[PDB]
Amino acid sequence: EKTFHKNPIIKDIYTADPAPMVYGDTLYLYTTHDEDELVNDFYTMNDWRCFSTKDMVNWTDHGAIFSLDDIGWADARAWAPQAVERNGKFYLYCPVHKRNGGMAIAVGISDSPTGPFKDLGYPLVDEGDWNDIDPTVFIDDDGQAYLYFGNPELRYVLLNENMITYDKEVGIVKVPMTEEAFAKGSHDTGTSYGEGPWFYKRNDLYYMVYAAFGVGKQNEHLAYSTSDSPTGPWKYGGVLMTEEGGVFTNHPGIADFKGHSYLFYHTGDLPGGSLFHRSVCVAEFTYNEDGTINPIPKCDGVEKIN
Numbered sequence: 001e002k003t004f005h006k007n008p009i010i011k012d013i014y015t016a017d018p019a020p021m022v023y024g025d026t027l028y029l030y031t032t033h034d035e036d037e038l039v040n041d042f043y044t045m046n047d048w049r050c051f052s053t054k055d056m057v058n059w060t061d062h063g064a065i066f067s068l069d070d071i072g073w074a075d076a077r078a079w080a081p082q083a084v085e086r087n088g089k090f091y092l093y094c095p096v097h098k099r100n101g102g103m104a105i106a107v108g109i110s111d112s113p114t115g116p117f118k119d120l121g122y123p124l125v126d127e128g129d130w131n132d133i134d135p136t137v138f139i140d141d142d143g144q145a146y147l148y149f150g151n152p153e154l155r156y157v158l159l160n161e162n163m164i165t166y167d168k169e170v171g172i173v174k175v176p177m178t179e180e181a182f183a184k185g186s187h188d189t190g191t192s193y194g195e196g197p198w199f200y201k202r203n204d205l206y207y208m209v210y211a212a213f214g215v216g217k218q219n220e221h222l223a224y225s226t227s228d229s230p231t232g233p234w235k236y237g238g239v240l241m242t243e244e245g246g247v248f249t250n251h252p253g254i255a256d257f258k259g260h261s262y263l264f265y266h267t268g269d270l271p272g273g274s275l276f277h278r279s280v281c282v283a284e285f286t287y288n289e290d291g292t293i294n295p296i297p298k299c300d301g302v303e304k305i306n
């Protein structure tokens with residue numbers, strides 16, 4: 001019986017920007033995909049992948065579940081996604097380049113967590129600028145869903161119950177980009193907030209985890225902030241994972257599965273790995289009693305769970 005799985009999770013394909021979703025007895029891990037053959041020696045990202053597990057050590061590869069070619073209005077940049085389930089359907093939020101436009105958020109819909117996903121037909125969020133990447137979605141206890149996104153500015157909308165529209169009266173809301181919320185740092189706002197927001201609630205505390213840029217630093221680390229409310233005010237928490245052992249990017253995804261807590265992240269540790277050929281990894285961790293989280297070291301692998 002296999003009882004351990006050594007990182008990186010998947011070894012025959014380069015993956016990044018992990019977004020776990022637990023539904024019932026199964027954890028589904030959605031990722032971006034760094035092509036084996038790079039175009040112009042640079043990031044080459046066309047489709048999204050899904051890998052599932054029932055036990056954290058045996059993984060099933062579902063291949064491409066959605067792609068830029070499935071989105072009629074988008075031409076480039078299959079960037080960090082997140083999926084969510086609601087009312088018997090699965091929604092995949094994907095940041096992409098809108099042809100002849102800026103960065104927009106697509107929503108794909110499927111009756112299955114492993115697709116194939118069908119694009120809505122037009123963008124869900126489309127402000128005309130280049131900020132709105134790396135969406136994260138969470139459905140709160142009161143039934144209100146939120147969609148956060150952005151680099152270098154964190155923004156959100158209130159998603160409606162159908163998950164394919166948002167409240168246009170509230171519109172797109174900007175988060176104040178303060179040191180109080182996101183620490184001092186080297187990103188465009190002068191705070192450490194970078195990209196890859198990951199929004200959720202656990203035991204009456206809300207969390208915003210993100211890729212971050214420290215003062216005087218070039219590479220991303222992972223950090224987090226907290227709030228008593230889903231829309232703030234956000235207060236800086238601390239470092240969740242340092243840059244050590246990583247590549248220029250890191251990107252967080254957190255899930256509880258069968259009573260255990262996991263941080264998914266990425267590195268360039270696969271054979272032939274690099275900043276453009278990444279690999280998703282996972283570390284188990286535990287929360288402090290007061291809801292804070294100590295820094296998580298990079299991890300050799302995880303144990304089977306039941």
Ligand SMILES: [Ca+2]
Pocket residue numbers: 017018019080081082134135136196197198251252253
């Ligand atoms: Ca993400």
